[model samples]
Target: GSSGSSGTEDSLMPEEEFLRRNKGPVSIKVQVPNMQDKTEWKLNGQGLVFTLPLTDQVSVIKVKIHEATGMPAGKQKLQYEGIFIKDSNSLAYYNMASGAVIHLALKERSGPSSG
Candidate 1:
C-alpha cells in the first residue's frame, strides 16, 4: 500500500485563489486617457485591467498596479472622473459604480507642496 499524495495541483490553490478573490466585488475599469505625445505605454491601444474592491483605498490600489504596470506607490496619480484623487481615500468614498471607468496617470513631484 503506497499512500503517497503530495503533488496534486488539480485545482486552483488557495494562495492564488484568495489572492485574486480578495481583490473585491466591485472591479472598476482603469484606462489611460489619450495624450498628445507619449512614447511608452502603447500596447495595441490597450494595456491592463484589474478587479479591485471598492473598499480598497487609493494607496492600496496604487500598490496593486506595480506588478502589472510601470506605476508605483507614490507615483500613482489617479483622477476620479477627471478630478484629482489623492491617497487616504477609499474607492467607496468616490461613489464609483462597478461599470464605471477610471483614469490613471503616472507622475512624481520633486518640488515643494504649498499652494
Candidate 2:
C-alpha cells in the first residue's frame, strides 16, 4: 500500500520518494525578492508597496520640482517627501530595507504663499 501524499508531488518514485518518506511534515515556503540601488521612483494615485530587506542601510529618496528646479512661479504646486538616513549601518535586517513603499504626494497649487 502507498500513503503520505499531499498531492503536491508526482509518482516518479525517485529522490522524491526519499524526501516524501523522510519528510514527516511538509510545508510551503514563499520568498519575496529585494529592491536596492534602484532609484527614480514615482507615486501613482494609490501608492507603492514593498517589504523592507535585511540590510544595514536603506534610503527613500525623493526629488520634487521645488527642490530640484525650484520654479520661479510662486504658484508652482509641488510637494517633496522622502525618508533619508545618513548611515543605517545599525538598522540591518527586517528593521529596514528598500522594499518599503516610499510615498510622494505633490498637490496642486493651493495659493501663492503655498509651497
Considering every candidate listed, which one attains the maximal TM-score? 1
Give one digit per residue, the lDDT tens place, for model 2 in 6-107: 543233244334444433221111121222332232212233233332322323221222243322222222221233222222223213222333333333
Error of 1 at 95 (Å): 1.6
Instruction: Give me the runs in candidate 1 sitting further than 4 Å from their true place.
Output: 1-24, 33-44, 108-115
- How much does candidate 2 score in TM-score? 0.20
lDDT tens readout by residue for model 1, 17-65:
4435544466656675554355343323443466656555677766666
Q: Write down the lDDT of every candidate, Cα atoms only.
A: 0.58, 0.29
Residue 69's lDDT within candidate 1 is 55
